[PDB]
Homo-oligomer: 432 residues x 3
């Protein structure tokens, strides 16, 4: 439970409040990415280039089929994993293996549609499966032929058509190696985001989502957070395609979990300028404080959205600091020319008026701050419009038992923190 | 003030000297990015796809217009911010809000040109505003229609034209969501680099700069450093466009500020190989040393260019080390097979001749180093061409009071530094 | 030498074993990237735009030619570097300078083919040099003209052809500045990966490799690891091209070097849930342990592939921990809702049955764990199929002197580790 009045006196001002969300239950859609295109219309001119290409595709997929079959043979049917056959695995790996087995029904439904997939002549098509599920099938290369070669085909000789298609087949191959590289090497454990899958399809993830029945504008939270992901459930070596299953997860709101932002400003210590060291975000669960590493999460207007729960333990001293004992708040000296010197909270302005400019516009007078005063509070008790630095701002009233003051503030120890500095410091401590 | 003679004896060799620059005053140009294209020529074939598209654009921009109006209503007219209405903000946020108000004059000048923007039929066009400012207007989609559909339109049926344009409209939409995503969610505080804006325009930032009156080759320092940035000043929901203001800042040379590079090499300690731990870059201001985090700056041939002043405090022990007391310089043991074992400074070579190969080519003799000697200096007093490792090099003369030696060098404490290692070490220290 | 039985008792389970590889000897191929295209077929319509373009290219390359000549003049002929003329350099810089001199023979062979390069009319061409080496020559722009303008040229007026080509020339220029930016500023020391070079050629690295005589599928280890790189050996300012030399290195298997993965799980301490802090990867050389920073390496199915040898020293306490003294293993408390609670190793399952669900399926009974027990081992001595969490798994037999137990496990000190937390903690330690 954060204590805001004692924190503001060491320059820590209450910022925005966000709620906390984590990935919830799954929902899936099926997709096929074709590696071997339908080249009807250019077959006689491109015969040489196309046969070379097909052989390369086969060599890429054969090792993938072996990896997928190796895992399927370790699961029998809930489903039981053969621990001895698998030998070594993480809990996540074992779970992925079981999931692959469960998805085999969809893989078979897709395989039985092989002819419909092969005979598709449009870059994007939707097929129906025997189990009433839909399948999104894409062949980027066919699109490029339909748009760039066919409309002008009567102007091109076969040598030109052959060379032109060969370059297209080749650049597509490079896009596959880049987007699915890791997934082809480890098809059981690797997941691919929708924005990465779309890099094979000219980067058009909006089209892929539309086929699967979604509007991009309605998926902002899971799309932007990178939570729409797929995995390889099957491959067909001779047909030349990869079967993916794509997840569109729900989000779970975590009860009694609040993420609070803190806004540090500089403060005065007998003529010197200092800043207090606290984490930007603090996670509170009912009553307890913990650390939240938001560099691994997406922060939105109202929510912090994480894939999993990333709460980390907070040190004893930091909890003591945040709960109101300022003698435990480590501070660092400011040496650079800029640092935030004011902030707005609940309509009031907190500022270091010894390092920035504070004036009352109603009276055209300067605002003083004694050297023993750490921060100054600007409210509407005496003046409505203040000049703070290069801006003018109107403020509200102060709520409290009496006039705000920061005349006798207990400060924590000074620190210098860096990788090299800690090395030198800790060595000095143990050497002495 | 760095002491180079005592530092070279622990393997720290003086490297290149750079000056220091930070962002200076702004200069701006106006731009409009059209989301709804001019489709004259295909209107009858694309009617269905185009109407769906326009509705999606409207839904994307409406929330942006609300965010922009919400901030404008908090500023009245210098301009005064309503702190109570805003409630909670950083100093940066308040400044951004005031800036938005100031840019409203340009937003109105652009709005009054709405018909000229809508009736543009070229991918890139320059318009004149009533206030004698120019406006750069782009519509990437129109370019694609002019280049890929119109020249072959007599070969295409309407079903084909409809589908072909639909895919283009859709992929453009995806590029907008990726490039301006964060900016549409927070249009007041988010800034976009020119190389990111250009990702909507086929990645052609040179064309965008040319229209705005600049040559890319003359903007290397601010272009490469990521300092050319824009922000959203207005949107037009029904017209389907975003109005941006793009900054082309001047750079400020910081007086008496010098950034000095240090080049660590290994050295000998009684048969073991050690390296001293110092920061690669040290910032000096007149006489004082501080840390500079160059991972956040662009380092060029002669300058270190930072957006803001990022100087950080340096620890007491590290200052003592760098100023000549080598007993304060922490060292780490070398366990890997490679480490720099020599360096060139002021025409002279410093090397660890117990771990690498040092020979005099003039006499074809080996160069000895006693076990108590930390580093050896190779100069032209005795030999002109030296073999150092696998290279041959000519050297200059040594400037000093007498022969260089490193026979009695006081060394600092040994350390091992990592995240896990510090955890274990600090725990051991407090537990004991 | 890792001690696995005592480590499993604090939740550290043996994971996968990888071998260790580093970059070996070089092999090279030559390439030319043309900046000034062959525009035969559109010369009369594009005259204005083309002349402006050529002037811009000249201005970009002139400074590069000066940097290259400045270094060549410091090397005479093994080759000898002029240390005085160079002044200040790292060992790496001096080596790069010597290498540039050695590559000058190839630069001359390329220059003598200038007319063959200029008269090439296909996007990708292979030329023969007088020294029997091949040269890969690319001109992306020519490809775009051959594919998008010529087939429809009778439908386009000159104004249209002029504008259309101008946009293509301009976007190409932007791609060059992005891909070779750093290389043009520092042509002696900067290296470019093949996937970055290919970003000038529509991202088609498979085509570039094919011309140079390679199959992408056979280069997975060096291609994916980023070890296929080139450097600028020459430029021709008037002709408008950059000459590159591209390296295709062999890999060296490091003898007696093994990289071992560790898999941490949670464990019980009197009702609390804790996890032990160890590095994920440990490098062993014959008998010695060291740290390996794999974030700088590519991890493949069987190998860890690094550019250079990145072994780092390991602390005394961590070695003691890993070699069997568990009182030296620092631990951290779990506060988040998820943590791995089991793992599979050598067919056996290790689990924390106080925090997850453990049951025997053969008898349909729960598996107990006393509060004083740290971890539980699930083997086939009593039950074949276990339920662990939400999965079912079959297990093998335990190899040892008797029944596995973890009743009296000595634990190391508790820690909280973060950047801020260490700052506060170390300050408290020195202040007290
Ligand atoms: C652990 O605590 C000790 C004692 O405070 C630290 O040693 C002292 O550190 C200060 C800087 O914080 C040194 O500053 C100098 O003090 C003298 C006063 O004699 C003043 O004239 C100088 O201008 C400067 O301010 C002080 O010399 C130094 N004391 C000694 C005996 O060396 C120590 O650095 C702390 N350890 C860590 C890792 O922080
Ligand atoms: C703080 O200082 C103490 C005392 O120097 C450190 O304890 C000692 O650390 C060394 C390694 O630096 C251990 O190495 C061993 O020393 C014995 C000599 O008895 C030698 O035969 C071994 O081959 C090895 O070199 C030494 O055992 C250990 N001393 C004790 C009593 O355990 C301590 O590690 C330092 N703390 C930190 C965080 O650095
Ligand atoms: C270095 O060691 C000392 C001594 O263990 C640490 O001080 C103590 O730290 C613990 C937390 O680890 C504090 O926890 C509290 O203990 C009281 C028992 O009196 C209990 O009732 C509370 O609920 C809570 O568990 C303990 O108060 C504190 N001791 C004192 C005198 O303040 C110190 O934090 C360690 N330093 C570092 C950097 O770890
Ligand atoms: C290739 O096949 C198409 C479709 O039947 C035909 O129109 C074209 O003339 C054929 N080209 C050659 C060289 O046979
Ligand atoms: C569409 O409009 C254009 C321009 O007037 C015309 O040439 C074309 O024939 C029209 N197509 C149809 C299907 O009406
Ligand atoms: C440009 O040159 C080509 C090739 O000789 C010719 O066919 C075309 O008509 C010329 N165009 C003009 C405007 O002279």
């Amino acid at each position: 439970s954060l204590h805001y009045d004692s924190l503001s006196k060491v320059g820590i001002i209450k910022g925005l409040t966000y709620n906390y969300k984590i990935k919830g239950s799954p929902s899936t859609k099926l997709m096929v990415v074709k590696l071997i295109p339908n080249i009807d219309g250019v077959r006689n001119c491109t015969q040489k280039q196309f046969d070379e290409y097909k052989n390369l595709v086969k060599n890429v997929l054969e090792p993938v089929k072996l990896a997928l079959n190796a895992m399927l043979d370790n699961v029998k049917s809930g489903a039981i994993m053969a621990g001895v056959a698998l030998g070594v695995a993480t809990a996540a790996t074992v779970t992925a293996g079981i999931a692959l087995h469960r998805s085999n029904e969809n893989a078979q439904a897709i395989a039985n549609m092989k002819n419909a997939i092969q005979n598709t002549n449009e870059a994007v098509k939707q097929l129906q499966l025997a189990n009433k599920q839909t399948l999104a099938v894409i062949d980027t290369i066919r699109g490029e032929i339909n748009n760039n070669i066919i409309p002008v085909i009567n102007q091109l000789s076969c040598d030109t058509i052959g060379l032109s298609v060969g370059i297209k087949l080749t650049q597509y191959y490079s896009e596959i190696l880049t987007a699915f590289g890791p997934a082809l090497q480890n098809p059981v454990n690797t997941r691919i985001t929708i924005q990465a899958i779309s890099s094979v399809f000219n980067r058009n993830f909006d089209e892929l989502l539309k086929i699967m029945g979604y509007t991009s504008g309605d998926l902002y939270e899971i799309l932007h957070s990178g939570l729409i992901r797929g995995n390889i459930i099957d491959v067909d070596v001779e047909a030349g395609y990869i079967a993916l299953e794509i997840e569109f997860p729900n989000l779970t709101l975590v009860p009694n979990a609040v993420v609070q932002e803190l806004m540090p400003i500089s403060y005065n210590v007998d003529g010197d300028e200092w800043v207090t060291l606290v984490p930007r975000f603090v996670l509170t669960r009912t009553t307890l404080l913990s650390n939240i590493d938001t560099s691994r999460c997406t922060v939105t207007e109202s929510s912090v959205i994480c894939d999993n729960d990333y709460a980390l333990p907070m040190s004893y001293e930091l909890i003591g600091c945040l709960q109101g004992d300022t003698s435990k708040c480590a501070r660092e000296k400011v040496v650079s020319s800029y640092v935030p010197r004011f902030a707005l909270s609940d309509g009031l302005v907190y500022a270091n008026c010894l390092n920035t400019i504070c004036r009352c516009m109603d009276t055209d007078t300067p605002i003083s701050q004694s050297l023993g005063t750490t921060v100054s509070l600007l409210d509407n008790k005496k003046c409505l419009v203040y000049q703070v630095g290069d801006i003018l701002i109107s403020v509200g009233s102060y709520l409290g038992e009496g006039e705000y003051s920061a005349d006798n503030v207990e400060l924590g120890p000074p620190v210098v923190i860096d990788k090299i500095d800690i090395g030198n410091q800790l060595a000095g401590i143990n050497q002495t």
